Design a protein around this ligand. Sequence first.
Ligand SMILES: NC(=O)c1ccc[n+]([C@@H]2O[C@H](COP(=O)([O-])OP(=O)(O)OC[C@H]3O[C@@H](n4cnc5c(N)ncnc54)[C@H](OP(=O)(O)O)[C@@H]3O)[C@@H](O)[C@H]2O)c1
Ligand SMILES: NC(=O)c1ccc[n+]([C@@H]2O[C@H](COP(=O)([O-])OP(=O)(O)OC[C@H]3O[C@@H](n4cnc5c(N)ncnc54)[C@H](OP(=O)(O)O)[C@@H]3O)[C@@H](O)[C@H]2O)c1
Lengths: 243, 243
Amino acid sequence: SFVPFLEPFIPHENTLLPELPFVTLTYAQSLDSRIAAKKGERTVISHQETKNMTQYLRSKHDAILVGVKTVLADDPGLNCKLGTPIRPIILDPTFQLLSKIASLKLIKLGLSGEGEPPVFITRKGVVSPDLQANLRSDYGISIVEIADRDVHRGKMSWFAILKILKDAEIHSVMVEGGATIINDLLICRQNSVPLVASLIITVGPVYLGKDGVEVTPARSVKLGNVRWWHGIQDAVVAASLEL
Amino acid sequence: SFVPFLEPFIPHENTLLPELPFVTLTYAQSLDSRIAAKKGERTVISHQETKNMTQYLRSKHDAILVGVKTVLADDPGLNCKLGTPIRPIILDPTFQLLSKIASLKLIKLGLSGEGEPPVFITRKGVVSPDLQANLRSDYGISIVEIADRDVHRGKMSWFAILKILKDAEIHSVMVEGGATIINDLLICRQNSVPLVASLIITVGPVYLGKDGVEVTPARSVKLGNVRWWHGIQDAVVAASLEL
Ligand SMILES: NC(=O)c1ccc[n+]([C@@H]2O[C@H](COP(=O)([O-])OP(=O)(O)OC[C@H]3O[C@@H](n4cnc5c(N)ncnc54)[C@H](OP(=O)(O)O)[C@@H]3O)[C@@H](O)[C@H]2O)c1
Ligand SMILES: NC(=O)c1ccc[n+]([C@@H]2O[C@H](COP(=O)([O-])OP(=O)(O)OC[C@H]3O[C@@H](n4cnc5c(N)ncnc54)[C@H](OP(=O)(O)O)[C@@H]3O)[C@@H](O)[C@H]2O)c1
């Protein structure tokens, strides 16, 4: 089963970057490395056993992180079907989702207790102190700010994002997407050391085509400690990123 | 390992288009669905375990087909290391390979007996009959022409290409690339019936990045009879295309 397969890759202590959480980067792709169908089309990539595997992986992480455009497109719950607590983290630099905050599934789950209180990562000063206090009371959310010196030409440093999560006592985070975040984290290094600890990819037996949402890093990326698993329809590769 | 895995997918008589050969479309891709590294970078995708699989597949086919730009990039031999004969077919609409004919590995193997006499598929009128006779004597090659009626927008009809191969007693052909040929054949249909009978893909645990040679069809493509194999480093999926 996928349980012994994943055992070397689930979060642990042997980390080269103690200031950061253990980071798992994990997603499901078509054969042509798309992670969503073309606009207006339905996305079917991962089948039931690897969906079970993804929920199992969530049961091993303190937090789950996705980008604002994933929330807008998918309205994900960001909890764990096994029932273990996982903290939802949404990267939303200008807090686009504020105008939608009352209707999001992840907000409803936080209020009902079926999920944990969400955290939104924004630029400094997007939400005033007073408004942060009201949003915490009314919608059960917290705001974490990235310092101006950690944003260059509009892009937040992943080192800075992960350090702030670790300081919020998040010891492990499962980063699921979307493609912008995946492409960036595949190449992110701190003195040649990757910020991602484990890469876990489900490959579904489908082509989504040239107009789907593409994953491909800006340069070639080598993998180490590679192990494969497969079920009936899907395969899974797990690896580290090479130095 | 891979021999019982591939048994349902090696050429067989259960075909819906008896006018055509059994077509296997098969290639090796990176995780981001690239089949060659960016210009000037070394391409390392398939490891020896699946190289052996590709050679096994060649031993089960009458012919092997690649495009002219694959020949220019890779100088492939296009024979079978297991010693069985296989007929090389090169899609070269303008017979650009005349410019390098005496130096091609595939020409050398044909003259040495280690490979079979190659066939180049061109547009009509590209190689004069007098020249065809002299190149048959000098380099042991044949030219096959696609009629003008079977060329649309500059693109040769795959049904027309495959019919001519079938009429030359090629009962099975292994199409290995490159990306243009793969992308086109993934979507090619004759009255809802795919021309490709077996799809066999090696997935290597590497990213080649945004500037590599990409495979992605023009629209989504659904797969059936899916099965997976994996080794130390690579995975392989075998499938048929749905109607
Ligand atoms: N198949 C899978 O496993 C999977 C998993 C997750 C998501 N998806 C799909 O992915 C698609 C969304 O992908 P996407 O690329 O459009 O969106 P995304 O990666 O989820 O979010 C991108 C946004 O997040 C912000 N962002 C990300 N990194 C940042 C950084 N370092 N610094 C500052 N801002 C940053 C930017 O927001 P601003 O634009 O406001 O600056 C950026 O436009 C959806 O269709 C979803 O269904 C698939
Ligand atoms: N990893 C693997 O398994 C694998 C396998 C094979 C190749 N490759 C790599 O793929 C790359 C080559 O890919 P590519 O797309 O550039 O070349 P390609 O597909 O091998 O050949 C393309 C050329 O063939 C012609 N062509 C193909 N289909 C045609 C059609 N229906 N009608 C008329 N002409 C047609 C066009 O030639 P004209 O320009 O003369 O009109 C076209 O430019 C190489 O880098 C190679 O190493 C990888």
